[PDB]
């Protein structure tokens with residue numbers, strides 16, 4: 001199936017378009033091309049500073065009757081400087097206004113760590129450490145629950161929560177809505193078997209981010225592993241007459257994950273969608289799992305002292 005059933009009763013397309021780092025001047029056309037060639041899920045965030053432009057594309061494709069709003073699955077995320085209870089609705093409403101929507105299909109706590117509120121996304125002290133907010137995930141989660149009860153979002157979820165944090169939500173006293181999704185980094189170099197099985201065992205759908213290893217991440221270095229250039233992955237693609245990127249997108253799909261590759265390149269947007277016509281073998285899958293090396297694209301040094309930093313622990 002091209003959609004997975006969430007625990008709020010709604011279906012979610014297992015392929016979406018990512019938008020982190022998509023330039024504001026190219027992402028409108030990017031999203032337009034993606035809807036044209038079949039994408040029905042867009043992954044967004046206020047912190048990506050491009051939601052206005054993403055929204056232009058969505059609204060034009062609705063106006064043009066290329067798609068109906070019910071057919072779209074639009075995701076956004078609450079940024080760390082808005083974890084305070086009095087800030088969550090407004091933050092969601094800004095995202096909605098920019099996306100030109102009246103509801104989101106899914107809204108995620110973007111990271112478990114709350115940062116000091118302000119105009120700065122990454123407020124730092126004079127030594128470079130991120131400045132925390134004294135908020136905790138449970139009260140943040142309660143705030144998210146209110147968005148559901150106000151009709152602003154159809155589903156709520158979390159992102160970059162480790163096993164212990166997910167379990168803390170599930171065990172929250174007075175828990176009203178379980179998280180629908182946990183969006184986490186996942187690719188052959190960071191395979192996440194434990195976290196994913198934990199989440200799935202609990203009926204929480206996992207979305208895999210940076211499935212191609214984020215070659216355009218701004219902190220990339222020479223000695224870093226490179227998925228798209230891995231000869232072992234290239235050979236598996238070769239065997240299937242597909243591209244390395246296609247193998248890397250199909251890989252999570254077959255683990256019952258949602259995957260959200262980013263591109264602003266029209267030929268690549270289209271290539272990336274052509275992944276429903278082939279299957280990796282079970283041996284291919286285990287072989288790709290074997291390349292795990294616990295390598296993370298996303299884990300900003302400045303945040304590692306936050307009490308709620310998610311990656312000190314195994315998973």
Ligand SMILES: NC(=O)c1ccc[n+]([C@@H]2O[C@H](COP(=O)([O-])OP(=O)(O)OC[C@H]3O[C@@H](n4cnc5c(N)ncnc54)[C@H](OP(=O)(O)O)[C@@H]3O)[C@@H](O)[C@H]2O)c1
Nearest residue numbers: 018019020209210211212213214216245261262263264265
């Ligand atoms: N929850 C969070 O914390 C979090 C964190 C990171 C990412 N995410 C989401 O996940 C999405 C995807 O992750 P990502 O942006 O880090 O990286 P990614 O999707 O792993 O990689 C994007 C990079 O791959 C290139 N690319 C795309 N398709 C390609 C293809 N077929 N062949 C060769 N190169 C290709 C893109 O180039 P062009 O664009 O130039 O074509 C871009 O440089 C994000 O955009 C965001 O929506 C969420």
Ligand SMILES: O=C(O)Cc1nn(Cc2nc3cc(C(F)(F)F)ccc3s2)c(=O)c2ccccc12
Nearest residue numbers: 020047048111112113298299300303306309310
């Ligand atoms: O956020 C995105 O979607 C992509 C993303 N990732 N990162 C690396 C990060 N690593 C983190 C670690 C924590 C931590 F929780 F671990 F403290 C909290 C927050 C972050 S941001 C960034 O620095 C970033 C900056 C602008 C826009 C998007 C991003």
